[PDB]
Amino acid sequence: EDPPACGSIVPRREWRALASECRERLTRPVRYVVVSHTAGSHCDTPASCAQQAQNVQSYHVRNLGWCDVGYNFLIGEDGLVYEGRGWNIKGAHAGPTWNPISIGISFMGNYMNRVPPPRALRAAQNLLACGVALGALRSNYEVKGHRDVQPTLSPGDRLYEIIQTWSHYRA
Amino acid sequence: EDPPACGSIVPRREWRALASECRERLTRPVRYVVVSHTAGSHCDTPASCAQQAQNVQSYHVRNLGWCDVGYNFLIGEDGLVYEGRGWNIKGAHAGPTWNPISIGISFMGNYMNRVPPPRALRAAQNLLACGVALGALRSNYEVKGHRDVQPTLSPGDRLYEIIQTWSHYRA
Ligand SMILES: CCCCCCCCCCCCCCCC(=O)O
């Protein structure tokens, strides 16, 4: 229901997601974007990646007791973006400092010794673009690695060096 | 014009397409979008869909002797948009009356007794928005079924019924 909709995103319902219980909202236009990797399994198909979105969310909700999967968005290697908390709800990916002043997107998989296909990178940037068009993101926006803000290897050596060559990337 | 690049499209190089020998351009902004199906085998993974787009292009160039894949864009059930002749080049999808004044989008598969998945419909729709934003399509552009402009079943009863419900569909 109620879809138009931008950057070709797989809606929560499409991926058979449990419902959110999160309330805290993000004050848009948002300034930062933090890229992480789930550090979980990778997947390269609509089917496999939906099952992985579930797996990630399930771990976050049933096990860490969170109100919803931690990320605002998840990127699959199938080149599709999966809906997490979204543009409006504050995420849980970067620590109390960074969670309310940024959107966090996560690439499903471990990218330490592996690199994400061009399509996933496309879906990523394309995702950010839609964000500006929406007022959710800030056109002047800045990109940061998960590791650029938290003692963590995330989003992986391989992927980390790519987002640095991104134009909107700041260190 | 309107600089920022739009949406996620799998480029030619990526699905391994033969080089295009087409030269006749379209006059921007285009007023019509004609939707068809390939009535060929469907595909639901980036991997399998790239092959299929190739099979379709192949069949058009090698067997029908066209300058390129007939469609301007192809949609896969993997939820991805496959680049063909693209926005600026007259295609070969709908006859001499319609090929000079329209964009042809084809859904890979036969949608007579199957509907395409939401991710497919979503990609197709997001693409059209991309066209508008770019100025390749009129903001008031009109979507037509292939059967509405030529005598064919394509784009399939199921998919035809769906596009009828689109904001820009005019029989
Ligand atoms: C290049 C970046 C993406 C731009 C693509 C065009 C954006 C138009 C599509 C916006 C979605 C239409 C509905 C409005 C949003 C909503 O209802 O939530």
DSSP line for A66-126:
-SS-S-SEEE-TTS-EEESS-SSB---SS-TTTTTSEEEEEESS--SS----HHHHHHHHH
Query: Cα separation of A158 and A40, whole Å?
Result: 16
Best probe of the A interface among B122, B125, B128, by most A CBs < 10 A, is B122
Query: A22, A42, A14, A32: which is closest to A145 by C-alpha?
Result: A32
Taking an 8 Å cut-off on Cβ atoms, the answer to whether A7 and B117 are in contact is no
Ligand 1 is surrounded, with C-beta below 6 A, by A 4-6, 129-130, 133; B 4, 6-7, 129-130, 133
What does each C-alpha distance from B9 to A13, A19, A120, A128, A136 come to in angstroms? 24, 31, 11, 15, 23
User: Omega of the bond prior to B116 within 30 degrees of 0, cis?
Assistant: no
* 8 Å CB contact between B32 and B144: yes
Total residue count of chain B as it appears in this document: 171
Q: How far is B87 from chain A (nearest CA, A)?
A: 18
Resolution in A: 2.5
Three-class secondary structure of residue B60 per DSSP: helix
Tokens (6 digits) for A113? 């010794």
**What type of residue sits at position A134?**
L
- Which residue, by CA, sits nearest to atom 8 of ligand 1? B129
Question: Is any Cβ of chain A less than 8 angstroms from the Cβ of B7?
Answer: yes
Cβ count within 10 A of residue A64: 9
Query: Cα separation of B7 and B83, whole Å?
Result: 12
**Ligand 1, atom nearest to A126 Cα:** 2
Nearest-Å Rg of the Cα atoms of chain A is 14
The beta strands (E) that lie in B21-161 are given as 30-37, 73-75, 81-83, 102-107, 137-145
Taking an 8 Å cut-off on Cβ atoms, the answer to whether B44 and A46 are in contact is yes
What is the four-CA torsion angle of B123, A118, A49, B122, rounded to 10 degrees? 0
**Ligand 1, atom nearest to B6 Cα:** 1
Query: B162, B128, B129, B130: which is closest to B145 by C-alpha?
Result: B162
The A residues from 76 to 115 touching B (CB cutoff 8 Å) are 78-80
Bridge pairing between strands B81-83 and B73-75: antiparallel
**What type of residue sits at position B21?**
E
* 8 Å CB contact between A116 and A110: no
What does each C-alpha distance from A151 to A33, A147, A157 come to in angstroms? 17, 6, 14
| CA torsion through residues B132, B136, B139, B145, sign | negative
Q: Which residues pair with A137 in a beta bridge?
A: A30
B134 contact residues in A (CB cutoff 8 A): none
Q: How far is A66 from chain B (nearest CA, A)?
A: 28
Question: Is any Cβ of chain A less than 8 angstroms from the Cβ of B123?
Answer: yes
Query: Cα separation of B92 and B56, whole Å?
Result: 13
Out of 3.40.1280.10, 3.40.50.1100, 3.90.1150.10, 3.40.80.10, which CATH number does the structure's domain A1-171 have? 3.40.80.10
* 8 Å CB contact between B40 and B4: no
What does each C-alpha distance from B99 to A18, B25, B144, B170 come to in angstroms? 46, 11, 13, 18
At a CB cut-off of 8 Å and minimum separation 6, what does B15 contact?
A: B49, B50, B53, B54, B82, B83
* 8 Å CB contact between A163 and A155: yes
Determine which helix (DSSP H) or strand (DSSP E) holds A30, and give its type and residue range. Answer: strand A30-37
> CB-based burial of residue B9 (10 Å sphere; 0-12 exposed, 13-18 middle, 19+ buried)?
buried
DSSP B4: S
Q: Find where tokens 């991805």 sit.
A: B80
Question: Is any Cβ of chain A less than 8 angstroms from the Cβ of B118?
Answer: yes
What is the four-CA torsion angle of A165, A170, B5, B8, rounded to 10 degrees? 70
